[PDB]
């Protein structure tokens, strides 16, 4: 199956980020995967002052490393990411485009109550 790495790093210079990306890609390939794509939202502001062992930072990127890792390896990869020091956090979620959307067509007209009480004059 397909997967995607939600790598979130800080503004820790260019060569350090490149080395961390290379390490992550090497680990993913050693685990039995194939690099699909490499994207990033740029070292922009963070949603909140977050720590990453153990300083506070407000500027970090959101690198996206797509891959095709096996089935029984997601937990191991998450543990490896948590073990890393330079990596803030990030849960490895399966590829989003792989989930075949169930063709829905807006809301349907919900009918009124279909009999809920007896018929008695009371």
């Amino acid at each position: 199956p397909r997967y995607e790495l939600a790598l979130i790093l800080k503004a820790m210079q260019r060569p350090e980020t490149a080395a961390t990306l290379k390490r992550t890609i090497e680990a993913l390939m050693d685990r039995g995967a194939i690099v699909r794509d490499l994207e990033n939202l740029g070292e922009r502001a963070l949603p909140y002052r977050i720590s990453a062992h153990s300083q506070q930072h407000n500027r970090g990127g959101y690198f996206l490393v797509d891959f095709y890792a096996p089935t029984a390896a997601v937990e191991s990869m998450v543990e490896h990411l948590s073990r890393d020091i330079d990596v803030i956090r990030g849960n490895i979620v399966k590829h989003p485009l792989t989930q075949e959307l169930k063709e829905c067509e807006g809301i349907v007209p919900v009918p009124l109550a279909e009999k809920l009480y007896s018929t008695k004059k009371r």
Partner: protein, 48 residues
């Protein structure tokens, strides 16, 4: 009730919101200030 989405669509939207909040792609206790340019999507009762 106010937003007006379907079951599956609203479920997916809230799941994505929660994933972004946990992983770190969206502020939890407030809205992302770097992306405020958004038309009146929902009927914001407050502030009229």
């Amino acid at each position: 009730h106010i937003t007006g989405l379907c079951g599956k669509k609203q479920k997916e939207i809230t799941k994505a919101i929660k994933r972004a909040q946990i992983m770190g792609f969206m502020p939890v206790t407030y809205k992302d200030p770097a992306y405020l340019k958004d038309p009146k999507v929902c009927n914001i009762r407050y502030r009229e």
